[PDB]
Assembly symmetry: C3
Homo-oligomer: 411 residues x 3
């Protein structure tokens, strides 16, 4: 039989998922998703006793529902079946947003989404080069999380720049049950913004007033290995070392406010790219207590051996996918990332078996390969070496090694 | 390329979601949903200390899958990603049902669905005029909840009336682990049943035998502000006052049975509509205990400034959507609702800090505006004023104010 | 309007769900699901006091997403909304897998799937003849569960046989946080493998090293009645007897290893089929403790009164659906299953109120009828009679009776 429509002409597409769209741009629907299956093995600092643990789990398992109605109104609902983002009271959302669009070039986004701070975070988790995002997000995780609901405005400006800003109602309350309000700004100058020709300078700022609020400020980096503690399958369990670098449990009235500044750069030329982000955080303490300070950076270099550039999008100021040219071979990509963090918490005044008085430091070397078999499937492996200072596992190790592999299917 | 089918002719449709159906009425599939993002601020009675709290949350985030097979067999599975209906044992279902239509005009529905009691409850939550349903459902929660599994028969009768009835296995057990069985009946005479031309008179009854059964009978109305306590994001937390009007926790053998009678009326002429429901509840006590009695009503006036009538459907005896006439400006609707409830629990014999001996009373005034931007998008604001008698917050407040806004997207 | 595509020609299908596929076999998407609504009533051994309990619940409520990309890469994501498989840490997955078929006839499967042990488990839960799978799986539930992540290879061999093997990272850890590794093998010789013409002989083996691991080894068969303890609705709650036949809670260091051997057969002559499985399990104990041993079998006879054979698939070595010949009548099927299990746990050295020293035994007789209304809808009733030895409920009953009905809708 035939397949017709009552309304405007429709075009349908499938690469394993589904797209249906009217040709007049008025209405559309997209059903997609991503599955990331990880297996990692790790030892030393990463585990409590320093022996090898493992983790087999889905890093992400999203079902993704998006569409357009009446040209200017869009929605996106991405739900994480692996339970690695969200919780069972707010919901396991990667995203639940509505966007208008009508004030083009200015876009207005409402709902649950990650606030815009950082190039690596802006980049789709399908296409982040490394298997895990950088260490600096571990020391300031509120700046670009989606743990709340808000409103964002964004615009490409003068065809060479991108600006975003939001107010976000966090799921942290003050003593009156009034939510902590988070403010974000991000501005990117990107005078070259094509795949294989990117020059990117970004500045970003986040602020929240913490007065009379109960907020968890414990900084507990996994140090580049997800499997020390993760949902989606299994992890190192009771032998996983997720060490406390500094900060406190959610006790009301410990802090005044929390501020983060970030500077970022990226340069892409053909198959080569370099990117780096630096951030500085200060949590101002209340009455007699000491401030919590944290800073860090990462630098990443990447090279597609098969020649294809990483996609770049000025709208969002973010990298994206690699589309393989050779349909049999696929695309092959090598990368290296260096990460370095420092946490200052002078509230820590006595030594322990795992924490020495002074600044906790962490650094990682990540070396990896991505095989893009095609636009649906990506197979990856990362070697990670961690080194810490003034923090260790219970065994006294200040270094650890890990190897993680991932099978990714997107539709 | 071409798009064809190997069965009967298919028609496809998208307005943000997806519909695929054979033109012989034999098979169909519909994927849709609804996202309701709320932000509320509220004080006085609504909070424990009387100060202003807020709540940013999804009221609902449904993914909706429905279809038809072999003409006469329908299914509908609606899942709440916002976690506001259901739980993590029974499932977060808005609906999971199978309908057989072969005995048309009689329909048979099986599974998890809300039992049919009340016009406002029968009305789709997409199209309920106010941001929250009326206070009388707070005093008789069980009469129209979906907290169980059952069988329902319903029919339009003589083109002028609607009847439904169900037996429902509640998720409440007696001492033998046998489920409380819930019985529902509803009958509506609607001699006029078209948009802008409605005369609706309804009677409804609900009964359950509670002998040796553990059932939560606590009546804890939110008093017209969802944000005092809700899933889907954040709420007033430890400062949210959800006051106990009466009733008891789930203990086996406190009660003999539970009966509810309801009367309802609705009238529409063009863009104006009025609707009202009254209910009376008695829970018969065992032993030397006193009965639990509750009664209440609401009345709602609504008017579409732009002239469009509310849709009305005789099948279900329910109001429905407003379709905007003007594609540029959309439709604008004003409404007022008055709610009034009374709870009599003579088991309460001593005063407490928030509850006086005697009948607890609550009334609200709700004033609101809906902008239907188009058939996908509705933006709303409600102002709510509450007044209680013999119940207060910890601050001794018996009045509260709230302002709540919603962005809704349906597909 | 028209419906077109910009890639290869597409065929779309709906029977309540959706399929979309390119005619060159390169890309496809399939959205489907299954809803199984059960109502059971049961007494005697099945309940703690021997009185009648009930259970109204969804046995399964899967949404099913599957597809193909670039010909050789397949995914399948099945999520259980009824909460009866998986958990809220690993996810409620029936399946989350990627299959590479490039090495055809050898298929490679990655992710979360049931390990391949047993004909009745290989059979889709849509088409399992009885409402609940056999008792032998209750005594060795790890051999074919999906509580972990792994890799499986499988192949039809020489047009007359099927072989599968896997390694599976279990969600059980040793003291180092290294997962218990499960190994499976299954081989089936099926020289006749067509509907109504089946001769099936299979051998299967499962092994896991449990050294220094914490694993729940409690054997707690429901004895043929799901309703004693289930998610998806309601169950017998505090009056549900799920008796402990033997084994221990997850204490690290109790066991050395766990081995299961299985033998199976199936025979089909037109509308008649017979199938049986036998298994034996030994959990070797550490240090001064006694081994846990379990063994059992089931035998099932099935006959389609209306004449249609059960489908059989050599790829997977499994039975499948019945496709009704009479559009009006549908298909009618009768079956009888006998199940018999024995659990030997010599660590039990003193009598209790519910358990006598010696081998715990259980046997069931299941008699049932299936009405396949059409290919989407199946209505079922099973009568179950249980008999136990050396184990009872608190009332002292060693026999129980149950009647369960199901409405199933598949799309
Ligand atoms: C101190 C300011 C805090 C404000 C935080 C608000 C976060 C709540 O976001 C929920 C979104 O719902 C808002 C509803 O308004 C929709 C308006 O849409 C109009 C589009 O043209
Ligand atoms: C000796 C009489 C025992 C029977 C007492 C039960 C009377 C009440 O019956 C209510 C049955 O509830 C039906 C619930 O079924 C819901 C599941 O729907 C799926 C149908 O297979
Ligand atoms: C192709 C990328 C790998 C990621 C796929 C996710 C599946 C994770 O499963 C973990 C595999 O565990 C197997 C480890 O077992 C160790 C012994 O292996 C012996 C195999 O004969
Ligand atoms: C034609 C197909 C070949 C079938 C061979 C399969 C044989 C394995 O079946 C497993 C069932 O074993 C049951 C053994 O239990 C013994 C029954 O004792 C009853 C004595 O009266
Ligand atoms: Ca029950
Ligand atoms: Ca709040
Ligand atoms: Ca592990
Ligand atoms: Cl879910």
């Amino acid at each position: 039989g035939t397949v017709t429509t009552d309304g405007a002409d429709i075009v349908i597409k499938t690469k394993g998922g589904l797209e249906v769209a009217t040709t007049d741009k008025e209405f559309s629907f997209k059903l997609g998703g991503r599955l990331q299956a990880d297996y990692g093995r790790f030892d030393g600092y990463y585990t409590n006793n320093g022996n090898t643990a493992d983790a087999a789990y889905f890093r992400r398992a999203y079902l993704e529902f998006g569409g357009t109605a009446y040209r200017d109104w869009k929605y996106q609902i991405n739900y994480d079946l692996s339970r690695n983002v969200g919780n069972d009271s707010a919901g396991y959302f990667d995203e639940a947003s509505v966007t208008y669009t009508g004030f083009n070039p200015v876009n207005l986004k409402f709902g649950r989404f990650y606030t815009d701070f950082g190039l690596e975070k802006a980049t789709s988790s399908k296409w982040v080069t490394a298997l895990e995002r950088n260490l600096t997000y571990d020391i300031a995780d509120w700046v670009n999380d989606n743990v709340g609901t808000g409103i964002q405005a964004s615009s490409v400006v003068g065809g060479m720049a991108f600006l975003s800003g939001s107010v976000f109602s966090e799921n942290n309350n003050d003593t009156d049950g009034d939510s902590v309000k988070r403010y974000n700004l991000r501005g990117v100058f990107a005078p070259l913004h094509e795949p294989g020709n990117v020059v990117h300078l970004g500045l970003q700022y986040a602020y929240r007033d913490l007065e009379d609020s109960a907020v968890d400020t414990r900084i507990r980096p996994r140090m580049g290995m997800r499997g020390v503690s993760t949902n989606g399958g299994n992890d190192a369990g009771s032998n996983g070392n997720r060490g406390l670098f500094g900060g406190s449990s959610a006790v009301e009235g410990l802090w005044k406010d929390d501020s983060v500044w970030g500077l970022e750069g990226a340069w892409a030329l053909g198959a080569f790219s370099a990117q780096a982000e630096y951030l500085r955080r200060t949590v101002k303490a209340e009455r007699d207590r000491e401030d919590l300070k944290a800073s860090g950076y990462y630098a990443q270099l990447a090279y597609t051996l098969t020649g294809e550039p990483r996609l770049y999008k000025l709208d969002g100021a973010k990298f994206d996918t690699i589309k393989p040219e050779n349909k049999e071979i696929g695309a092959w990509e090598l990368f290296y990332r260096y990460d370095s963090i420092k946490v200052e918490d002078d509230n820590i005044v006595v030594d322990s078996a795992t924490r020495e008085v002074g600044d906790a430091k962490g650094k990682t070397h990540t070396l990896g390969v991505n095989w893009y078999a095609n636009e649906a499937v990506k197979v990856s492996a990362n070697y990670v070496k961690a080194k810490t200072d003034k923090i260790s596992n219970a065994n006294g190790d200040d270094s650890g090694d890990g190897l993680v592999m991932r099978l990714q299917y997107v539709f």
